[PDB]
Design a protein around this ligand. Sequence first.
Ligand SMILES: [Mg+2]
Ligand SMILES: [Mg+2]
Ligand SMILES: [Mg+2]
Ligand SMILES: [Mg+2]
Ligand SMILES: [Mg+2]
Ligand SMILES: [Mg+2]
Ligand SMILES: [Mg+2]
Ligand SMILES: [Mg+2]
Ligand SMILES: [Mg+2]
Ligand SMILES: [Mg+2]
Ligand SMILES: [Mg+2]
Ligand SMILES: [Mg+2]
Ligand SMILES: [Mg+2]
Ligand SMILES: [Mg+2]
Ligand SMILES: [Mg+2]
Ligand SMILES: [Mg+2]
Ligand SMILES: [Mg+2]
Ligand SMILES: [Mg+2]
Ligand SMILES: [Mg+2]
Ligand SMILES: [Mg+2]
Ligand SMILES: [Mg+2]
Ligand SMILES: [Mg+2]
Ligand SMILES: [Mg+2]
Ligand SMILES: [Mg+2]
Ligand SMILES: [Mg+2]
Ligand SMILES: [Mg+2]
Ligand SMILES: [Mg+2]
Ligand SMILES: [Mg+2]
Ligand SMILES: [Mg+2]
Ligand SMILES: [Mg+2]
Ligand SMILES: [Mg+2]
Ligand SMILES: [Mg+2]
Ligand SMILES: [Mg+2]
Ligand SMILES: [Mg+2]
Ligand SMILES: [Mg+2]
Ligand SMILES: [Mg+2]
Ligand SMILES: [Mg+2]
Ligand SMILES: [Mg+2]
Ligand SMILES: [Mg+2]
Ligand SMILES: [Mg+2]
Ligand SMILES: [Mg+2]
Ligand SMILES: [Mg+2]
Lengths: 247, 230, 56, 121, 68
Amino acid sequence: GRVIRNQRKGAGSIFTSHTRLRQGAAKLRTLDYAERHGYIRGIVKQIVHDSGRGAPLAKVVFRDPYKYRLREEIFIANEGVHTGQFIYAGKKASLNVGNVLPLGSVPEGTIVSNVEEKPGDRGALARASGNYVIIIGHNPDENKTRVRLPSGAKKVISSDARGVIGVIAGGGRVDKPLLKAGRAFHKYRLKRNSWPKTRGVAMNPVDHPHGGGNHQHIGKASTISRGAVSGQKAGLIAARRTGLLRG
Amino acid sequence: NPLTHSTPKNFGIGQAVQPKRNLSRYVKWPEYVRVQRQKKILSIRLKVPPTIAQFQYTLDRNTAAETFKLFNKYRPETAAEKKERLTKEAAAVAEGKSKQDASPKPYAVKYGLNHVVALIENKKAKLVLIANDVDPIELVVFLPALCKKMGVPYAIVKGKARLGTLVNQKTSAVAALTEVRAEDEAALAKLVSTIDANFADKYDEVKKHWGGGILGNKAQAKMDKRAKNS
Amino acid sequence: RPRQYATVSKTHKTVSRAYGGSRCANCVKERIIRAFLIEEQKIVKKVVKEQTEAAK
Amino acid sequence: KALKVRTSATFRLPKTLKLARAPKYASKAVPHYNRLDSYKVIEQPITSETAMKKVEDGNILVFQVSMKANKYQIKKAVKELYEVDVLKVNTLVRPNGTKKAYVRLTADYDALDIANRIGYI
Amino acid sequence: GAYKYLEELQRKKQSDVLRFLQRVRVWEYRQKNVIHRAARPTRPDKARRLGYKAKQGFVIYRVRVRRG
RNA sequence: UUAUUCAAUGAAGCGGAGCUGGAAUUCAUUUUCCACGUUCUAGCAUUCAAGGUCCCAUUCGGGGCUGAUCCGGGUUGAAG
RNA sequence: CUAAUUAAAACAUAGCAUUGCGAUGGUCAGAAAGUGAUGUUGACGCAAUGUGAUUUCUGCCCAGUGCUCUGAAUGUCAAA
RNA sequence: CGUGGGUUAGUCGAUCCUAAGAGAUGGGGAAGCUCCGUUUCAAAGGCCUGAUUUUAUGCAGGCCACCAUCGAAAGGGAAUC
Ligand SMILES: [Mg+2]
Ligand SMILES: [Mg+2]
Ligand SMILES: [Mg+2]
Ligand SMILES: [Mg+2]
Ligand SMILES: [Mg+2]
Ligand SMILES: [Mg+2]
Ligand SMILES: [Mg+2]
Ligand SMILES: [Mg+2]
Ligand SMILES: [Mg+2]
Ligand SMILES: [Mg+2]
Ligand SMILES: [Mg+2]
Ligand SMILES: [Mg+2]
Ligand SMILES: [Mg+2]
Ligand SMILES: [Mg+2]
Ligand SMILES: [Mg+2]
Ligand SMILES: [Mg+2]
Ligand SMILES: [Mg+2]
Ligand SMILES: [Mg+2]
Ligand SMILES: [Mg+2]
Ligand SMILES: [Mg+2]
Ligand SMILES: [Mg+2]
Ligand SMILES: [Mg+2]
Ligand SMILES: [Mg+2]
Ligand SMILES: [Mg+2]
Ligand SMILES: [Mg+2]
Ligand SMILES: [Mg+2]
Ligand SMILES: [Mg+2]
Ligand SMILES: [Mg+2]
Ligand SMILES: [Mg+2]
Ligand SMILES: [Mg+2]
Ligand SMILES: [Mg+2]
Ligand SMILES: [Mg+2]
Ligand SMILES: [Mg+2]
Ligand SMILES: [Mg+2]
Ligand SMILES: [Mg+2]
Ligand SMILES: [Mg+2]
Ligand SMILES: [Mg+2]
Ligand SMILES: [Mg+2]
Ligand SMILES: [Mg+2]
Ligand SMILES: [Mg+2]
Ligand SMILES: [Mg+2]
Ligand SMILES: [Mg+2]
């Protein structure tokens, strides 16, 4: 009869993300006239490390088109992007790794990253390290582009949505064992409080639906309805199937 | 001058920071400005039932200039001349002693909504000017129908401010003539003949026509663009 | 320390070159050379683009 | 239909004229007198033996002063209550909650002479 | 005078004219603050019969409350 | 689409018309279209902009216009 | 780690595996909201679980119960 | 226990700055006590004139698109031996 650990996560007190050492939000440049009609040249100044993020972050300086000053945009660095490299962003930009282009102005089978779902949301898709979006189709009439997502999902998005050529740098990061609890400790120390995880079968019945009993066991099906309520969704929620991928 | 030289700046994309241009189309206006422009927009976007927007069919500048030229010969008394003729009437009560009546009959425009509606209902108004800018419009919306039923000629005219100018108010919302002097019968007869031509002899057809349904600039452009495409 | 710089004279805070107390005499040399060869490349690009647009 | 050329897309609130106040009636009808004059600033001398040593040797007059009085007010009140020059004023709040000023006089003045003019030691 | 006409015309709410006026006005008041000052009564005859006089000392405020 | 909804921005360039060139083989008509000044390089880009043109009533300086095309005042997009 | 009777074989752990979710979304807050946590996030990610380093293996059973499925649309069916 | 005496700062600290965070306003919610929110969907703003006699300097141009405030006697910080 006690509020369980996943229900306490939404109150956001000790389960907030640890955001002191992060460099800022990584976004694309704002979709302005220069990117909508031509291109703009920025410069990679630093490739830095973002805390909690597996991917390195490029700091790219553009000239402000309407005032005399410099705008520093924070990009997710694509693999091969180097300091001092010019980055071109706009409809008329070229097919180079690091360049920011609308997806309608881009051929088929092109690998892109930091892809807007809607034109002007400044980067939504394929942002984690090593991830990319394949362009798998164009529907020029009532402009739409079919893309393939890193989960394998096909998705039709707008041709005016912008992506960045290349894959996200930092790939292969989950290819290393952590080997030890301290490396997971320092990994999650700058993400958020979600580790270590006590199992619900190891708790009392007051703490979890899986809690209690004279042996640690579940006792009802771990598969939970989508139409179940908070406190009940502790297991394999709305599972179409279970078990190993074996035919 | 050989010391001067021509630079010319390249205000393209990606070169030579843009000059000061007119950005008045892009101004984030205050909310009262935005809502008063968008109210005007919405009231003509929607289909307008024919009872309202028989307004904006207005007495145009020429016949309205003639109408105000006649109506400004019948301006009501200011406070100054009322104070003058009250002292003159007090002197008349002192020595003249007709009854109380040294003052003549006054010939003034009739204003005030209840008063002019009473005059129309008693068939005393010879001409009713109705402001087209009255808000709420429900105050004056029944007046073409009541004027038409009583046979009073009405003109919908621009300016509750402008009617207020001749009745010495700020806003008047109506003005009426119920009797004019001997010199102005011909002018009132010409004005009634053109005003009934514009308003009361068109009223049967104007009762049927819905107003509004006006597309915007871009919606009219893409409305005729796909007409060309078809 | 940063507020001690308001007490010393301009000489201690500056080198007598362009970008004196900001850049490091090799980055200054690099940016002079980069400037000059890029305007020379700009006028070569201008003449070449004018020739290929006036010839075809 | 000429319209103002706006080179900015931000509307700001216009700088309207501000009138100063011009009241029909006075706010409190009598200005208060000096709430900390010199007779308020200086309460009394301190005649502890430790203070008398400072008078006889260091040329410091030791006073109990008002709790509201800063070192400027102590210096001004000493300067026109005893007609002396003040080199320095040092001040402490005592543990019994009253203020004490060690007023060091300029070497043109003898604190022993001034203290015997006042009436203590 | 005109207040009797206003009285009888306010009861025809699902007429075309009051439906148009209702829609333009419900957009207008929703674009304002939840409580705001009205410069004048939009139902002046209802204000007469509820006690408002048009003189200095009487104030109209328009207010919107959530339903349900 | 105008209510409602979502989104973004220092609400900056939206929409519609406007010079040429042509693989429109000018068919004597923009039934008809595209391109709107920037890609070797970790430089630089700000003073209502120089230029050109017109007026001040000239005062060692100032004001227009064009440079920088008009028109609609729908900030722009999505959704309905 | 059971402060003050249980320091363990219990819990955690790396490793393994399963599940949900491509954002007007998953999971979770809040009486409501023009409100929130994850989220300065985007599937090498977040969220929910189980098992518990390495080695070697993980057999059979979809009847029951749960979960799930553009699945059948005159079986049942409320308000209007 | 009774009676007094004693704490002196331009330089040591606080004061100031921001931190995790707390929190007004604008605005929305809530029967309401109050809740949310912290730059948001607000008409949110005060600074020098290049140096002086028609100037309590302004009734001159001109610039800034920032947005309460609180929050560390171990963090940052003007200066004494
Ligand atoms: Mg509890
Ligand atoms: Mg609880
Ligand atoms: Mg949990
Ligand atoms: Mg946070
Ligand atoms: Mg964790
Ligand atoms: Mg685990
Ligand atoms: Mg576990
Ligand atoms: Mg237990
Ligand atoms: Mg137990
Ligand atoms: Mg339970
Ligand atoms: Mg159990
Ligand atoms: Mg077990
Ligand atoms: Mg279930
Ligand atoms: Mg307002
Ligand atoms: Mg006053
Ligand atoms: Mg002190
Ligand atoms: Mg009454
Ligand atoms: Mg009033
Ligand atoms: Mg509508
Ligand atoms: Mg815009
Ligand atoms: Mg205990
Ligand atoms: Mg114990
Ligand atoms: Mg133990
Ligand atoms: Mg023990
Ligand atoms: Mg246990
Ligand atoms: Mg957050
Ligand atoms: Mg264990
Ligand atoms: Mg084992
Ligand atoms: Mg089974
Ligand atoms: Mg039924
Ligand atoms: Mg004692
Ligand atoms: Mg004692
Ligand atoms: Mg100090
Ligand atoms: Mg602060
Ligand atoms: Mg609060
Ligand atoms: Mg509210
Ligand atoms: Mg406080
Ligand atoms: Mg503070
Ligand atoms: Mg400190
Ligand atoms: Mg530090
Ligand atoms: Mg410190
Ligand atoms: Mg300090």
